[PDB]
Amino acid sequence: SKVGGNYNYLYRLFRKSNLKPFERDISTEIYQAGSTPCNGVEGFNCYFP
Amino acid sequence: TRFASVYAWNRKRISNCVADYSVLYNSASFSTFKCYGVSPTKLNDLCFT
């Protein structure tokens, strides 16, 4: 704990499917929650996990 | 025509109907879309109570 908040801890938020016990997922990429492709660029409906 | 305020919101019950959101594509232009507890792509094949 320190002044201004410690910002070295990160967690996953979005994934297409579920995981398996004792499995790691380090693939970081932009995700689309809709039908329009993200085109590799963050923007509308494109949120970073 | 008109909406409600933050301190006095509204509640409506919708039941006994078929879910088809495809009619929002021609007119509606949203700015935020986040879902919890269910996949956005799987909503057509499920039921809601």
From Swiss-Prot, chain A:
Record region (Disordered): 13-48
Q: In UniProt terms, what is the effect of altering E42A?
A: In strain: Omicron/BA.1, Omicron/BA.2, Omicron/BA.2.12.1, Omicron/BA.2.75, Omicron/BA.4, Omicron/BA.5, Omicron/BQ.1.1, Omicron/XBB.1.5, Omicron/EG.5.1
Question: Effect of altering K2T?
Answer: In strain: Omicron/BQ.1.1
Q: What does changing F48L do?
A: Increased resistance to neutralizing antibodies and human covalescent sera neutralization
Q: What is the effect of changing E42D?
A: Increased replication in human TMEM106B overexpressing cells
Q: Which cysteines are joined by disulfide bonds?
A: C38-C46
Q: How does it assemble?
A: Binds to host ACE2. RBD also interacts with the N-linked glycan on 'Asn-90' of ACE2. Cleavage of S generates a polybasic C-terminal sequence on S1 that binds to host Neuropilin-1 (NRP1) and Neuropilin-2 (NRP2) receptors. Interacts with host integrin alpha-5/beta-1 (ITGA5:ITGB1) and with ACE2 in complex with integrin alpha-5/beta-1 (ITGA5:ITGB1). May interact via cytoplasmic c-terminus with M protein. May interact (via N-terminus) with host bilirubin and biliverdin, thereby preventing antibody binding to the SARS-CoV-2 spike NTD via an allosteric mechanism.
Q: Per its record, how is this protein called by name?
A: Spike protein S1
Q: Which organism is it from?
A: Severe acute respiratory syndrome coronavirus 2 (2019-nCoV)
